[PDB]
């Protein structure tokens, strides 16, 4: 999306980095070798930043039926930062990611993997009376969306609900 | 970056001692040592510092000799300047160190001609330590003693980065006979809290850990928000760590108060409505991943284009905190200034 | 040319004594690891590394274990990895194992070799590429890889029996001493290391056993040229002794992200599971299921905890965290359990507070008792008003009155008391069932 | 004020046995000026202007006044009945010392930078600072000691931490019979150290006052690099209650100031100290560092061979200290100037014959020689006569030589005031003079 | 102030015309002699082109004792879209606008002038059965100010009242 733009015009791009896994570096590298000012900067400083910021544009994993989001971690704080400013919040997602679920069951709604992420094993006893949590995904309410960016056009969040009913029969909802 | 050009960056492996004479110099060889240490980040901490730098001028006082015929009152003023240009050049300084500045300015000015030199440098000793005495230890004592009273058995407390009086206060109250749980979190270009969970893991507390972008996860549970300070701004707000503000925003949006803890010899004047402009940078090389073998941002200075940022303190509005816990008691946030400075 | 597919080479029996209040009546492979037989763990393990071939051989109590095996899901014909027993009444050490396998001539490329109790998750795609290359650079020159994880001196997981300290040449990992360091104050070390390089020489004791090596089949022809050989300690000494000529060097691979355990008392069972409960070793977690049954199913929750299928609560019972919960368990109320595993099929009374503890199969537990850090195995039965001190096993069968307070350490058992007499009151109280096995 | 340099100079050292040619080291010449400038040099370039040397009188004659340089030395005149070490050499100038000291002794031809090690000592407040330099191969071409029968040397091991900062262990190979032997609590505190057996010392010892205080109440130690340095690196482990008053009242006495960590109660360690355990610094007060220089010129004045290596490569330092010092001096008269190497030193008074065949050689002051002369990689200074027809080749001279006609030597070494016959050499000295 | 730091630094100024006098024509000038990047607009604009402001700087009339303002009619909905958007707004003005009055009554708060601003008179016919009102004062609550600045420095809305304290005996409040 935004390779395609930057072909006519000129802007600043800034990333932030995931930091359980860094992986906002091979995006970051990736948009400078194609010619864009881009800058990278860590998870801690999202809210002193959002005064500067003109446009918010993320992808997503899954979206439910109400219109709710289910992001990566660190997305709530970002969509808060930028509704406290009233700046604008878009998605970029395909057809094939709308699901036919409410945001009921919960418990496996994240995901959780090793804690060796987060704390080395070379800590010593301290492991031993310590808890430690590592969440991947995380749950966005739809007040904080303003647009969806389809393969057909563009759409409101209360749009979605409509577009399910022609997609899939209410008899197959549940396996 | 063109946004935060203004402010100058510094590096940490630049020795400033190797054109410098080595058996003394102009320098004093104490605030050599101290810049020294200063620069490789031995010494880190707001109140630490102070500390050790009232110590090297207690060290640089008692060798003096006076001129002989200019008096002291002048001479030191003088010869002071040049170490602490020097010291500002190793590291920016605080708002600690320049309380401690003034007041030291002022004693040495308010000096008599009509004494000794002896008696001089005996009065100046005793008061340098009286004030290290009085505004630190005792305030320290008396903000835990008041602060001991909101807490309670079964609570949840939430505390961030790491800082003394923080700990302190929580040792004490749990040697007091309360029981509780702490949650600590952790931001990633330091990794400054694991301190803290020593500490509190030593001293028999249960305890977890985990990253800041984590932090909607665990809030649900958690009742009471704990915070320290490195400085308080003249309209009322709150200087900090970077990180302190989004603590404070999610904490609003799920209904969980918030309490602050600072010395109120950390009042300064300054006036500022962002968290920006006014701040200081580090060296963008720390934030390389080490993972396996991809190593991104590795001779980032090849690619035209890129820029790292490195932010080191956020300015929190008085909007987001309900308590401000001092050694003259507990006050709101927007009362700060109506009660520190109008005692002028 | 591809090499050989993978092949590993499985040690089922224990060849010791140090589980023997208990072994008598099930084999060490069969205990039940977090509701799961501690054999399947190897199995999956080398599953997923991607073996294709394993044997298993099997001496003591070898039915139960055929038994167990037919069963599993790894001798269905749609499983990728193929399974054949072995078992003869004649093997006493791993020696014997080994002179076997080379007799029979079964492997004929680089293999793995391993005990029937690792937990572990390791990818050894890298190791075993290093291998390759080093052996094909030289000649027979290397004849193992050992492997180990980094860890601290001080970790929950390191028992005083398994610890041990290394010399190691920096530039190619190479073990040129390794020594055990029990019941020892000062190591020594030979000064004839020294004279061989100048700064390469380093002294490491961060570093943990897997107990996982990558052998070659000339290690088999070792085995049966030596008749004194036993375990594998004697065949690294004598390796490492005898520097005269032939096979001489041996090659160490330290990891850093990832896990690799051994179980070999209670004390390293106890750790081993405490760490599988808390996701340490995750892509192997008990809501995944592995062993495709379907009589283990739970759900997961928050502060790590886990419930099976059709379990019933009481009112006012509070779990704190690392609870698990097998299918049927009945539980009364205004209960209180911490870190605590039950087995399925369980009856538990009201008032119980459950800390630290384990609970096999089929054991009952009445109302009003006390319980810590203690081991309980099947159709085991409790009293009222009984206190077990921490350190305390139970076998089969056993049931203890009420009314009493065993001391620290207390072990009991209905077989023979140390190898016909009436159960003495005073040691299993009034209705017991068992003898005192102090020692 | 911060150091009082020490520069002692009783004889060369502690091993004078296998280097003592004609002449008392502290005053030997060779490299035109003598040894002892060297240091001193080095000191003046620093910014140091006041050195303390102790030495006998004959050394001391004429250098009460000899130069005029910004040092004003005080200088000691040690008895001359006895050889002492340098232990109490340190307690008898204990009276003129008031503030840390910088021993160092007359033999370095170093030119490394000070500031790294001082930075050390700055940085971590070290209680000890030494300098050492990695074994570097002794290649090059046979001293002529009989041209064989080289004796075994009793090695050296050196355990230090993995970052190469601290020195955790060090012992000699003399005591040792087959094997070492590792305290173990020290593994529980440092799990991985490297070890190093082919180092050369550089006697650079940096030391705090209470160093001597201590050294001054006990008189059994002799020699700070054989008794203090291993005794200081042991005890630096030992715990202050451990398992083997009126005990010699041992270091941790003899301390009574604080550290980096024992500064208030709320210096405390909760990142008040780096962030780790409390108890780290309380009682670990003996701390010692090393600085471990990889490449450079490093080396002690002892033996043969460095007698000619060190003049082999010392006129590129020299100029590379001196810019306005040439090779050739004013006072010297060259009838053939186009066969002179460009390290071709050649002193005041130096009358120099037909076909000067000059190269990789040092020619000193007042010399004498005449036509047909090739001298190559060979140096000689100190009045020497020399004839038509010599031919040279690494044969040093030392003073007051008479060479006859055809007299062809190479590599001998020849001193003591001696004339040498015609056509008369031999692979090295054997007679010398 | 703005002339002063126009001596050093480059920015660009937006102003409202503030109808019906239109006194914003005069600014405008005044600023462009100066030298400095001006763009003049209708007062119905401002809700749209807010959301590419930085800084909102105005004047004012009287400051009251608890921190409201009484400036010209425009003034209130300007103070409304920045909050919109939590765009700082600063105050400047000396200290003897400073009155120990409160809003109780605002019947002699605002001042109404003819309506011949409005509607002229030669619209006759229709004028028997119209009623006009002009209004030019208007009343601006405390919680949409950051920020005091006068001839001593900056201070927060709620300090004002200390002043007051400091400044006027409370015998004389009420003339």
Known sequence: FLKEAARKRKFHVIVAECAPFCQGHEMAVNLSKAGIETTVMTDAAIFAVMSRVNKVIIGTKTILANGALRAVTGTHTLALAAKHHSTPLIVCAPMFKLSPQFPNEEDSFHKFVAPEEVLPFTEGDILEKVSVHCPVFDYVPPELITLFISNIGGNAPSYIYRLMSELYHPDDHVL | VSLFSHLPQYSRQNSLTQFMSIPSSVIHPAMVRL????????????????????????????????????????????????????????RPLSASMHNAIKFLNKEITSVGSSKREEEAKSELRAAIDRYVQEKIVLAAQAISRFAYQKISNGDVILVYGCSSLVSRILQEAWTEGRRFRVVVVDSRPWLEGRHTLRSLVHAGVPASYLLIPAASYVLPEVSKVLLGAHALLANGSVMSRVGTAQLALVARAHNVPVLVCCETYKFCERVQTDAFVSNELDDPDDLQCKRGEHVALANWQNHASLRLLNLVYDVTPPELVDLVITELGMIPCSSVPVVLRVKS | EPPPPLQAVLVADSFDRRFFPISKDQPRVLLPLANVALIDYTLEFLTATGVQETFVFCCWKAAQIKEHLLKSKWCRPTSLNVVRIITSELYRSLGDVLRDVDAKALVRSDFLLVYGDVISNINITRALEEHRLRRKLEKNVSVMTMIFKESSPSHPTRCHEDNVVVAVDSTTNRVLHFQKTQGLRRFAFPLSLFQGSSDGVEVRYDLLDCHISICSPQVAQLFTDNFDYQTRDDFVRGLLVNEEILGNQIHMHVTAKEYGARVSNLHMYSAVCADVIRRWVYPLTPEANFTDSTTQSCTHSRHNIYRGPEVSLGHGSILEENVLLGSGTVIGSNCFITNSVIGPGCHIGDNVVLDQTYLWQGVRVAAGAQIHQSLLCDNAEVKERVTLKPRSVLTSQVVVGPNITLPEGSVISLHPPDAMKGYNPAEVGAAGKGYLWKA | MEFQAVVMAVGGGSRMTDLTSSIPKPLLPVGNKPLIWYPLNLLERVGFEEVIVVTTRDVQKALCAEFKMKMKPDIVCIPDDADMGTADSLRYIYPKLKTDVLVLSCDLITDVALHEVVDLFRAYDASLAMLMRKGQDSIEPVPGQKGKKKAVEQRDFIGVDSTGKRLLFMANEADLDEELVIKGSILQKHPRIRFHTGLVDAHLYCLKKYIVDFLMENGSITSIRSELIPYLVRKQFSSASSQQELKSLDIYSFIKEANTLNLAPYDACWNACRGDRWEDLSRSQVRCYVHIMKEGLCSRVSTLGLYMEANRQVPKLLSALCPEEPPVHSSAQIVSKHLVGVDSLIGPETQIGEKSSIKRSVIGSSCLIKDRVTITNCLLMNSVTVEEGSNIQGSVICNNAVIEKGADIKDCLIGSGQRIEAKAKRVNEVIVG
């Open chain 2, 35 to 90: 810049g020294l240490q200063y620069s490789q980040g031995l010494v880190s901490g707001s109140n630490a510092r102070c500390i050790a730098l009232l110590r090297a001028l207690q060290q640089v006082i008692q060798d003096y000799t006076t001129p002989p015929n200019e008096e002291l009152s002048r001479d030191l003023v003088n010869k002071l300047k040049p170490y602490m240009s020097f010291l500002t050049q190793c």
